[PDB]
Amino acid sequence: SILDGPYQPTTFKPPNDYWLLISSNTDGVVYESTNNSDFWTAVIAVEPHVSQTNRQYVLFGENKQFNVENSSDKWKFFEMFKGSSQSDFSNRRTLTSNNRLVGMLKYGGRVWTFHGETPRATTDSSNTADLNNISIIIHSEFYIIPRSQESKCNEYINNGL
Numbered sequence: 001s002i003l004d005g006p007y008q009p010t011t012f013k014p015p016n017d018y019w020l021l022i023s024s025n026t027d028g029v030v031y032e033s034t035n036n037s038d039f040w041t042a043v044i045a046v047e048p049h050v051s052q053t054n055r056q057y058v059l060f061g062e063n064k065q066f067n068v069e070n071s072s073d074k075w076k077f078f079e080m081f082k083g084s085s086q087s088d089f090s091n092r093r094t095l096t097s098n099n100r101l102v103g104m105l106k107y108g109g110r111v112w113t114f115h116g117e118t119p120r121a122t123t124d125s126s127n128t129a130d131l132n133n134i135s136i137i138i139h140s141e142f143y144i145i146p147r148s149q150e151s152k153c154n155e156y157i158n159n160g161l
């Protein structure tokens with residue numbers, strides 16, 4: 001099947017040319033991805049209707065507090081990015097979604113994810129010189145979809161499983 005899964009939470013270096021479609025089941029860290037060279041992204045899930053609150057997360061072994069908020073009726077998935085070991089995280093992208101799926105693809109020297117607000121979320125890329133070595137710790141169930149079937153992945157991100 002085009003939609004391969006769901007797989008249990010795990011750690012691995014995903015193969016290039018496949019979307020990971022990650023199904024978030026609670027608030028907190030959805031995944032932590034890095035090559036320990038030029039790419040770090042952790043995604044943090046915040047449930048609907050959350051007034052500003054200090055929450056603490058473990059990101060790549062380090063405790064980080066963020067004041068988070070979500071005034072919408074949809075879940076929000078915040079990408080926290082840094083591009084070097086010695087740099088501060090920034091909320092680089094956000095996906096606002098009732099479907100509670102995020103996507104990550106390693107392809108052609110870039111990491112691709114979905115951002116924006118469903119059902120109109122789009123893909124966006126980050127460059128890396130060290131793509132293959134990007135590993136991911138995934139804290140919930142996920143699926144694997146070939147890049148050739150990205151249209152299906154897009155459909156799931158935007159309209160749900």
Ligand SMILES: CC(=O)N[C@H]1[C@H](O[C@H]2[C@@H](O)[C@@H](CO)O[C@@H](O[C@H]3[C@H](O)[C@@H](O)[C@H](O)O[C@@H]3CO)[C@@H]2O)O[C@H](CO)[C@@H](O)[C@@H]1O[C@@H]1O[C@H](CO)[C@H](O)[C@H](O)[C@H]1O[C@@H]1O[C@@H](C)[C@@H](O)[C@@H](O)[C@@H]1O
Pocket residue numbers: 105107108109110112122123124125147150154
């Ligand atoms: C236009 C396109 O193909 N966009 C898709 C994007 O493609 C880029 C990646 O392959 C990237 C490598 O990571 O390379 C980019 O190409 C580079 C060349 O490599 C470089 O030599 C040249 O100098 O510059 C170009 C441009 O920088 C590719 O453009 O890959 C994304 C991840 O798979 C994919 O999401 C994106 O697909 C589009 O996504 C948007 C939403 O953001 C819409 O759904 C579009 O409909 C969708 O494009 C459609 O699917 C793609 C795969 C392709 O078939 C399109 O023709 C089609 O409309």
